[PDB]
Design a binder for these strands. Structure first.
Ligand code: MG
Ligand code: MG
Ligand code: MG
Ligand code: MG
Ligand code: MG
Ligand code: MG
Ligand code: MG
Ligand code: MG
Ligand code: MG
Ligand code: MG
Ligand code: MG
Ligand code: MG
Ligand code: MG
Ligand code: MG
Ligand code: MG
Ligand code: MG
Ligand code: MG
Ligand code: MG
Ligand code: MG
Ligand code: MG
Ligand code: MG
Lengths: 149, 125, 72, 224, 129, 144
RNA sequence: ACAAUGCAAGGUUUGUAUUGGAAUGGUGGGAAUUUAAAACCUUCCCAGAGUAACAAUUGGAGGGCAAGUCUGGUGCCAGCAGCCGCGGUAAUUCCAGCUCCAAUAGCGUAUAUUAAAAUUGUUGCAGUUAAAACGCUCGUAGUUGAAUUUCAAAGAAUCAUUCUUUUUAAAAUCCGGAUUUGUUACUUUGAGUA
RNA sequence: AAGUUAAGGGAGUGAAGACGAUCAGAUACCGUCGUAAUCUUAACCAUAAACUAUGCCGACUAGGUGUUGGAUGAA
């Protein structure tokens, strides 16, 4: 684990066969449409994937549709400006900051806030290095709260 | 200016000056081949040693490397000339197998002693 | 030129002062069950004996021959 | 010189049931009696005799309620000068007795050491075959094989041991306290021992086994 | 974390040899590692090995002949010129008569002797005895 | 892990640590600090000439019992006062209370030698005659 | 140096005290030459060793470390001793004499330096307790960074191996044939260096 | 932890201090009393045998007895 002393290995691990299984009836177009609908309804990539797995009969959008789900969202144009994980981190940070504002003496929270900030800065940096974030994007503790939306 | 007439040490000293066995060996050598000091022995060791070093270096290179064939061959020839090897033992692995006796044999005094001329080594000298 | 002995299991090859290491000798059968004259041989190094894998190694060796039949 | 042999191997060796000490080494047998070793290396019959030396007689004190109580550890290296080296230790009250004990110990130890070659094989092996390294206590020594004309580059003690072993040409190292002579000696011995137990491309061959003295002559031992 | 897969694999192999295993599961296969293994096989030290393809970094399992004394990586893959080789080999491997010092060389990976024969030295991966 | 970095491009760290650490080596520090020239009577030299100021005794280290015969001398070079032990069975009297003595080290760089407490110097010539020669006596006699 | 006897030891020969003829530099003087002129070098001719006075020293002999528990003197004094130590009336250590040992026309002492030093550690140190893991985490530079992209295949020589030849895709170029295809590190050949 | 600064708080404990003993002496150990501190609030401090005296990430190697927290199966 990047920050704790946590060393767990709980993980999804996908099956050997990566051409979709026989029982999968859904044609790709339908699944794409479903994905789009889910996106519209406010769900994030991971969440969307989960929904697809559970509510509909489909293991992996990658086996049914050549593309992964983020890619298809992008194609359809409903991709977030601000990437999933990063966004989540930002939200968490914001929450922490609110708590701090409320409740000044919380040392552990402060420590954890610092850690989350650091992680954001890593993630943020990575995104900048690609082209998902713009280069003009620092993350600010003052702004942050407004950013998430 | 200084002269350009360069000069060189012919003999290295021991290292460990009162090792018994070595000393005894040296003394034996002196006895046998009528030598004046340990210095003579040291000088001959040095002479031998350079050659040995060269041989070692050559062996580190492979056969039909130009250097090995040329320089090694030359060395071998020199050894032959000196009366260190002769007919049977001319292969560059053999020039390592030289010892001090081999070299001392070819000293003039020793030769003289061998080929009649004088009753002794000392006498020959 | 004494060529030392190769542990038949692990091939480690075993020196003079090993002791420990053993040359176990297995006697053959001839149809009836009676002791045939011949003897099939395994040297076992000390290390394996110390470990306790020795028995396993022996079993494997037997399997490789025909002497016993289960492997593990 | 006659002695009533106790052990089976010894008994066998009493008569000409064994060719060489090589055979006994091969089947990793525990030599108990020094008499066996003596029999294998006599001045008559045999070629190279066992030249010995008291490399160190260190005095060693126990400190009882009434003063000191000195014993003398003797170390001895014993050596064929060709293949077989041995290294014995004995702590005893008198010096001579200790020395005597140590020679016996050395004989018991006596190990075959593989001499090999540097570079390529010409007449008769001379150096160690490969870099072998023993440790005992702090002192760890790494004999490295050398070319022919080199002597044993190494400490006096190491030189002494190596001549006995029958290595002519080597390169010593020595990490650790070499002033502690006994340990150094032990390390050297260990290194020497390692020479057979190394497993070179030479020895990939799986040559079928020889029969041990105990099965080949079991019938002859039933008489006694 | 991982850094040099190959090094780890070699360490594992060495450990297996020490124990006296027979089989051994080298856990992330790598082209380089495979090449190394092949080389080893060629010079007799290793038996068969069944590079098992997952759908990821593969696993190898490798069949051992009880024959390796040590095998190793020498990290910092030092560039090594053809003249510089000899000293390096002296430093490393136990005898001039045997052991192998494996270089990655612009003519694929090969041992020091091979390199010498060719003419090109290169970067030095590892070795065995 | 080793402790040290063994990267291919690591050289800067490797050099730099060594450069800093060298200074922990006592001998190296002695060689390369500038206080050598400052804080040393001979000022980086084999010997020095000093006129004598006082013939003096120095009591030895506790186990041994002697009064070692020293000479407190003033270096002409440096204006430094130093005790220099004088060898010989009776070689204090071979020198005068004001004699141009030539004094060497004792054998241990600065570090003091043997029974003597803090006398780091060995007078080895008086009025240009060799102390050793005088001691032998068959060789020479002190000119004055 | 050599040979005689005398003496010695060894399984007749080596070794070592009397003699005594051979050898020869050195040293002295002439030349020949050398050299700008001399001087040396070498060269020849006269001179010319037996205590071959034509005289070997230097530093050591407790250990480290080769060599004395030899003789007198000193008596925790003087002194020696790089270090450990020696000296308090047997000092194997001082001061001597004798004998021995080492290196020897050299041999000591000092200061510096290299090796010894894997005691600065790239190779190559150590960090529970010996000196040494920052109180802890984050963190920039720094160093380090999973796997993945043409794998392979066949023929001839040699003593399972070595060295060689041939083809297995795509694009541009040339009259179905034939021939170019990321950058740098790295490496190989060169070139050019007093 | 002590310590510092400022507000409260102030029971017990209790550096200081005071006696009582103890002892040749006792400015200590034992006892009685007893400020500072201990407590909170808001700052400083930035150190401890801050000790697993074991830097962190990684791979491998060997069994058993457990134990905290989940998951899987079966009784
Ligand atoms: Mg981290
Ligand atoms: Mg993990
Ligand atoms: Mg001029
Ligand atoms: Mg001695
Ligand atoms: Mg001295
Ligand atoms: Mg006396
Ligand atoms: Mg004396
Ligand atoms: Mg040094
Ligand atoms: Mg070194
Ligand atoms: Mg150290
Ligand atoms: Mg400590
Ligand atoms: Mg820590
Ligand atoms: Mg960084
Ligand atoms: Mg990679
Ligand atoms: Mg506090
Ligand atoms: Mg407080
Ligand atoms: Mg207050
Ligand atoms: Mg109160
Ligand atoms: Mg109270
Ligand atoms: Mg601290
Ligand atoms: Mg600590």
């Amino acid at each position: 684990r990047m920050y704790g002393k946590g060393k767990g290995i709980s993980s999804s691990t996908l099956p050997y066969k990566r051409k979709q299984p026989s029982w999968l009836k859904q044609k790709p177009s339908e699944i794409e449409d479903a994905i789009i609908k889910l996106a519209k309804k406010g769900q994030t990539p991971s969440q969307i994937g989960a929904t697809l797995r559970d509510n509909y009969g489909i293991p992996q959008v990658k086996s049914v549709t050549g593309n992964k789900i983020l890619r298809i969202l992008r194609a359809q144009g409903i991709a977030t400006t601000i990437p999933e994980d990063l966004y989540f981190l930002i939200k968490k940070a914001v929450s922490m900051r609110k708590h701090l504002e409320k409740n000044k003496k919380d040392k552990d929270c402060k420590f954890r806030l610092i850690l989350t900030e650091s992680k954001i800065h890593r993630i943020s940096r990575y995104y900048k290095r690609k082209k998902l974030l713009p280069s003009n994007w620092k993350y600010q503790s003052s702004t942050a709260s407004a950013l998430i939306a | 200016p200084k002269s350009y007439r360069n000069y060189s040490k012919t003999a290295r000293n021991p290292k460990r000056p009162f090792e018994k066995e070595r000393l005894d060996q040296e003394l034996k050598l002196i006895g046998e081949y009528g030598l004046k000091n340990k210095r003579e022995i040291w000088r001959v060791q040095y002479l031998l040693a350079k050659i040995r070093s060269a041989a070692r270096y050559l062996l580190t290179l492979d056969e039909k490397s130009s250097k090995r064939i040329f320089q090694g061959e030359a060395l071998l020839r020199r050894m032959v000339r000196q009366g260190l090897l002769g007919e049977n033992e001319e292969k560059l692995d053999y020039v390592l197998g030289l010892t001090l006796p081999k070299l001392l044999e070819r000293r003039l005094q020793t030769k003289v002693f061998k080929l009649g001329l004088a009753k002794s080594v000392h006498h020959a000298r | 030129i004494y060529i030392p002995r190769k542990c038949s299991a692990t091939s480690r090859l075993i020196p003079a002062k090993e002791h420990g290491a053993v040359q176990i000798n297995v006697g053959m059968v001839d149809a009836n069950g009676v002791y045939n004259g011949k003897t099939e041989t395994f040297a076992i190094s000390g290390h394996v004996r110390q470990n306790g894998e020795s028995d396993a190694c022996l079993n494997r060796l037997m399997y490789e021959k025909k002497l016993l039949s289960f492997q593990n | 010189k006659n002695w009533v042999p106790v052990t089976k191997l010894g008994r066998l060796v009493k008569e000409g049931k064994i060719v060489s000490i090589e055979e006994i080494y091969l089947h990793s047998l525990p030599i108990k009696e020094y008499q066996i070793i003596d029999y294998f290396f006599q001045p008559n019959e045999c070629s190279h005799p066992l030249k010995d030396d008291v490399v160190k007689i260190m005095p060693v004190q126990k400190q009882t309620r009434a003063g000191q109580r000195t014993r003398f550890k003797a170390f001895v290296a014993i050596g064929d000068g060709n293949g077989h080296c041995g290294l014995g230790v004995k702590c005893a009250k008198e010096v001579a007795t200790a020395i005597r004990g140590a020679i016996i110990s050395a004989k018991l130890s006596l190990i075959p050491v593989r001499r090999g070659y540097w570079g390529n094989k010409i007449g008769d092996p001379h150096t160690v075959p490969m870099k072998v390294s023993g440790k005992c206590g702090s002192v760890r020594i790494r004999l490295v094989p050398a070319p022919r004309g080199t002597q044993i580059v190494g400490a006096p003690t190491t030189k002494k041991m190596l001549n006995f072993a029958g290595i002519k040409d080597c390169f010593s190292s020595s990490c650790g306290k070499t002033k502690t002579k006994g340990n150094f000696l032990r390390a050297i011995f260990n290194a020497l021992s390692k020479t057979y137990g190394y497993l070179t491309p030479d020895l990939w061959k799986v040559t079928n086994f020889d029969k041990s003295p105990y099965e080949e002559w079991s019938d002859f031992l039933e008489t006694y | 974390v991982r850094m040099s897969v190959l090094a780890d694999c070699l360490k594992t192999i060495n450990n297996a040899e020490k124990r006296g295993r027979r089989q051994v599961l080298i856990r992330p296969s790598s082209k380089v590692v495979i090449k190394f293994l092949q080389y080893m096989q060629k010079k007799g030290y290793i038996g068969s090995f069944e590079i098992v393809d997952d759908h990821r970094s593969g696993k190898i399992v490798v069949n051992l002949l009880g024959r390796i004394n040590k095998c190793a990586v020498i990290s910092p893959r030092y560039d090594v010129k053809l003249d510089e080789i000899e000293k390096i080999i002296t430093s490393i491997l136990p005898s001039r008569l045997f052991g192998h010092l494996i270089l990655t060389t612009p003519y694929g990976i090969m041992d020091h002797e091979e390199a010498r024969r060719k003419h090109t030295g290169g970067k030095v991966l590892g070795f065995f005895f | 892990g080793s402790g040290k970095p063994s990267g291919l491009r690591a050289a800067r760290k490797l050099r730099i640590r060594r450069r800093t650490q060298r200074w922990a080596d006592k001998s190296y520090k002695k060689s390369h600090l500038g206080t050598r020239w400052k804080s040393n009577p001979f000022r980086g030299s084999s010997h020095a000439k000093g006129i004598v100021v006082e013939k003096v005794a120095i009591e030895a280290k506790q186990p041994n019992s002697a009064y070692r015969k020293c000479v407190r001398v003033q270096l002409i070079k440096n204006g430094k006062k130093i005790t220099a032990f004088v060898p010989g069975d009776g070689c204090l009297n071979f020198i005068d209370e004001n004699d141009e003595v030539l004094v060497s080290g004792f054998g241990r760089s600065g570090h003091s030698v043997g029974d003597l407490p803090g006398v780091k110097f060995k007078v080895v010539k008086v009025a240009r005659v060799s102390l050793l020669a005088l001691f032998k006596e068959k060789k020479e006699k002190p000119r004055s």
